[model samples]
Target: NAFIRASRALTDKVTDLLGGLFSKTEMSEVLTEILRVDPAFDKDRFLKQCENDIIPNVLEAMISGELDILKDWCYEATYSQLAHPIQQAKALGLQFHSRILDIDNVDLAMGKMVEQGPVLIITFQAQLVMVVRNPKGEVVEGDPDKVLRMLYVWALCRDQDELNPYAAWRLLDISASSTEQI
Candidate 1:
C-alpha cells in the first residue's frame, strides 16, 4: 500500500540520519580510544559477549568493588559495633539484606516522584518511605543527598516496621534529632 511505503520511507530516512552521526569505524575507534585510556580493559572479551550479559556483569563487578570499599570504611568507623563475632555476622547479614532490597531502585521511583509529585502514589507498599529532614527538625524539600542518606539507613536497619518498632523508629528518628551542639 502507498501508506505502508511512505511509513517505511520515513523510518528509513530517520534511521539513516541517526546512523550518520557515527559510522561503525568511528564507533569502534572511540571504543578503542577508551580502552587505551584504561590499558587493563579487555575490549575483545567485552565484544565477544552478548551486550545484555556484558553490561549487567560489568555493572555488577563495579558495584561489588564499590560495596567492598564501603564495607571496609564502615567497619573501620564502627568496629566497636562489630567487635563480637556474632555482631560482625549480624552486620554482614544486614548488609546482604540491604543489597537484596535494591535501594538503588529509589532513583527510578524518584524519577516518577518528580514527574507526578505527592499526588502519585507508588504501589510498592513493602518499600519504606524515605523522609528528608533539615537540621532544624523540619521536613525539607529538594535535598537528594538527605533523602538518599535516609534511604541508606532505612535499608541498613534490620527491622521490618511492626516487628521491630523500636529499632525502626530509632533509625528514622536519630537522623532527625542528632545535631552538633555549637
Candidate 2:
C-alpha cells in the first residue's frame, strides 16, 4: 500500500503542479504534440510515469557524469518526444518478471546481470543480460549505496527496448507476460 500511496501522491490530481519547475502549459503543450504524433499514444499513462518516476530520475541522471544516457532518454524541457516509452514501460510493468532470467543462482551471472540487463544473451546458454546502466542507465563503478532492484533494472531494459522500432514493435500493445523467456 505504501507503493500505491507514494505513486498516488506523485500522480494525484495535481499533475500541472507536480510537473515540477517546468511550465504546466508547456507540459500540456508538449504532451499534446506527443499525442498528435501517435494516435496510439497512452497519455495518462505517460504523464503519470513522467510525473512520478522518470521526472525525478532525470534530475538524478543529470547529477551523475555517467548518466548522460539517461539524461538523453528523458525530456529536454518538453515531454512530447519523451513520453512514449514511459507509457509503454508502465503498461508492460517494465517486463520485469517477463524475460524470466530465473536466476536461481545470482552467482552464475550476478556481475554480468548487474550490467547487461535481464535478457539472456543466448537462448541456449543461461547467460542472462539486461542492457542498462550498472546503476540503472549509467555506470557507477558502483557504491553499495546505489544499487537498484533487479526487477527494476530489467524493466528499464524493457524501456530501452523502445530505442529500436523493430524491437519496440515486438513489444507494442503487449500484455505483461509471465511467460518466462526460458
Candidate 3:
C-alpha cells in the first residue's frame, strides 16, 4: 500500500545508483536477503517492502557508490580476522569480493565513502547475541547488528545455554564440546 507508493519515485534512480553492486537480475535476490535479516518475511507479503525499505537505504548509499562503505565492512570483516580481504575473497573464488574490498585497508582509504549510507540498525531479539567484527577486527561489546553497512552478518550463538558450557577445545577432549562448535 503506502510502501509501494513511496517507492515509485525511487526505482529508476536506484538502478542508476546501483552501479556494479547489483546485476539487474540479482537485486531482487539480494533484496530478499536484506529482508531475511528480519522475522517479517512471508513470501506472500513483504515482497514489495524490498523497494520501499531496501531501495531507499540502498539509494541513499549510492550518492557516492554504496560499495564504498560496504567493501570496508568486507575489508574489515575479513581483515579484522588477521587476513587480507582480497586473499579471503580470492580463496573462496569471490574475485569481485577482492577487487571491491581493499587488501590492507590502505587503498582509496574508504574512497570518500561515508557512514552517511544505510547503517543496518536492527533492534532484534535481546537473546540473539554474537561476536561482531569491524574495521578494526572483532569487537566484544555492543549490538552486532549495528556492525556494518550493506553487509548482512548473522551469527549462531551456539543456539545458547546448553552446548555453550559443554563447548570448545578449551574444554579439552570433551566429545560434547567438540560437537558444539558446529
Candidate 4:
C-alpha cells in the first residue's frame, strides 16, 4: 500500500508538471513531494557504480584496443551465468564483433519493485542495441527459460558510488524481463 501510494503520487506529480513548463519552484515542489513519498530512494549510488566500475573498464578496453578484454568484461559485468553456455558464448561473440562505435552515456532509473527486493536496471546504449547490467555489475543473461529472482535481489542490494541522471530516462518503459540482455 505504501509503495503504491508513493508510485501514484510521484507519477501524478510528474505528469502534471511535465504537461506544462513548470517553474523552478513548482518543479522543486513536485520533486520534493515525490521524494517525501519515496524517501529511501537513492539515485547517486546507481550512477557511480556504472561510471567507476563498468564504464571505465569498457572505456579502457576500447582505448587500449583490447577487444578481448572488452568482450570478457562486458560478459562478466552483464551476463555471468552457469546454465546457459550457448547464450554466454553468443554474448561474447557479439561483443567482440559488434562495433562499439561510441558510448554516449550511462543512465539510472529511479524506481523500486513491490513484493520483490530492490533492483536497478543499468542500461548501456551504443551504436546498436542497448545492454542491461545487473546490480552486481554483470550482464543479465537472456534466456526464455531462466528465472531471475536472485539477480533482481542482487541489483537491489548492490552498491553504487555516483549519480547519473541519464539512467532515470531509460527506466520509463522497463518491465520484469526488460532487463534481460539480448
Candidate 5:
C-alpha cells in the first residue's frame, strides 16, 4: 500500500512539472521538429552517443594529432580545418594537456541550414582543465592552476540514405564561446 501511495505521489509531481515547465519549452519544440523528420529518433540514445563517443573522440583526435579518427567522425572540411591547428602545434613542438572536468549543461535544438544539410545543434556547457606547454614543459596557454567553464556549440548532420536514414551522423562544425567566469 505504501509503495502504491508513493508511486501516485510521484505521478502527481510529474504532471505538475509538465504543466508548468516554462524554461525549457523551446527545447521541447525543437525536439518536435526532429521527430517530424524521423519518427524513430531516440533523444536519450542520441545524446549519449554524442557525449560519450563523438565529442570526446573528436576533441582527443584534434589534440593528439590523430587524423584517422576524424575520418570516421567528422566531415572532410571539418577534418581539414582541425588538421591546421594540430599541424601547427606539431611543427611548433607544443603539447596539450586538456581534460574535461564535467559536462554540466547540454541544450539540443534544430539548426539552421548553416551547412549544406539539415543539422542538429548541441550546446555543451562544460568545465575544462587545460594547459598548453612548449617542449620545455613551460605553460604557453591556459591556466593549469585553475579550471575553466566554457560553452561549445557543435553541429551534426547525416548524409541522405534512402535505405537507412540513420546511417551515420558527422560533426560538420564546432564553435566556441566564452562563459561568465567564476
Candidate 6:
C-alpha cells in the first residue's frame, strides 16, 4: 500500500510539472473562440480531415514537388515556404520519401480572430521517417532505419462568412518544431 501511494504521488507530481507545457493551456480557449463564429465546426471531423487528408496530401506534394496541385488548399506564402526544400533538393540532386509512422496527438495550439478571418494554429505530434536517396539509389540524408518524432505546426485560416458556416480552412503555414526528443 505504501509503494502504491508513493507511485501515485510521483505520477501526480509529473502531471503537475507538465501542466505548464506550451501546448497544454491554450487548446480550450482556442476551441471556444473558434466556435463563436463557426458554430458548426466539428472538432473530431476537423482533426480527422487534417490528419487523414491535409497532412498526407501536403507530404505527397512535398515529395513530388507539385505545389500547383495544392493551390486552393494552401496559402501563397505557404507555397513559398514549402518550395524551399523542394528547390534545394532538386539543386543538389537529392530526394526523399517522408513517411509518417504515426500521429500521436493533434491539438488546437492557438487561435485569434483577425479582420480577414479566424486564424488558428494546430499542432500535430507525429513520428515519421525520411529516407533520402540519390539518383543512383544511395542514401544521402536521414536514416532509413530510424524513426524520428516531430511536432508539425500548421496555421489555418477560415473565412468569416456567417452565411456559410462550413467555410474552407486554408492552410497558411507549416512549421516543423524542434522539441527535444524524449
Output the worst ten-in-a-row residue range by lDDT, candidate 1: 116-125
Error of model 2, residue 171, in angstroms = 24
TM-score of 6: 0.67
TM-score of 4: 0.29
**TM-score for each prediction?**
0.19, 0.25, 0.18, 0.29, 0.68, 0.67
lDDT, each prediction: 0.27, 0.29, 0.26, 0.38, 0.67, 0.66
Ranking according to TM-score, highest score first: 5, 6, 4, 2, 1, 3
Tens-digit per-residue lDDT, 64-181, candidate 2 = 3223445355333233333455445445433222122222111111111213222111011111232223325343233323322221111122223354322221111101112132
The runs of at least 3 residues in candidate 1 whose Cα sits more than 4 Å from the true structure, single-residue gaps closed, are: 1-20, 31-44, 48-66, 69-95, 98-182
Instruction: Quote the lDDT for 26 in model 1.
Output: 49
- Candidate number with the higher lDDT (2 or 5): 5
For model 4, residues 1-182, the per-residue Cα lDDT tens digits are 77546534543443343344434454355345435545554566646666566555554454333645544543232323321443554465433222233433344433344222233444433332234344454555343333322111112222132254322221112122222333
Please give the TM-score that candidate 1 achieves against the real structure.
0.19
Q: Residues 1-182, candidate 5, lDDT per residue (tens digit)?
A: 87546544543443344344453564465456556667788877887777877777776666556768777777888878887877788789888887777763444544444434556776666667778899999999878888776667788875544345445678898877555532
Candidate 4: Cα lDDT at 19 = 40
Looking at model 5, the pairs that clash are: none
Clashes in model 2: which pairs? 116-130, 116-131, 117-129, 117-130, 118-129, 118-130, 119-129
Return the lDDT, model 3, position 79: 23
- Local distance difference test, candidate 4: 0.38
Clashes of 5: 0
Residue range with the least summed lDDT across 10 consecutive positions in model 3:
168-177
Best by TM-score: 5
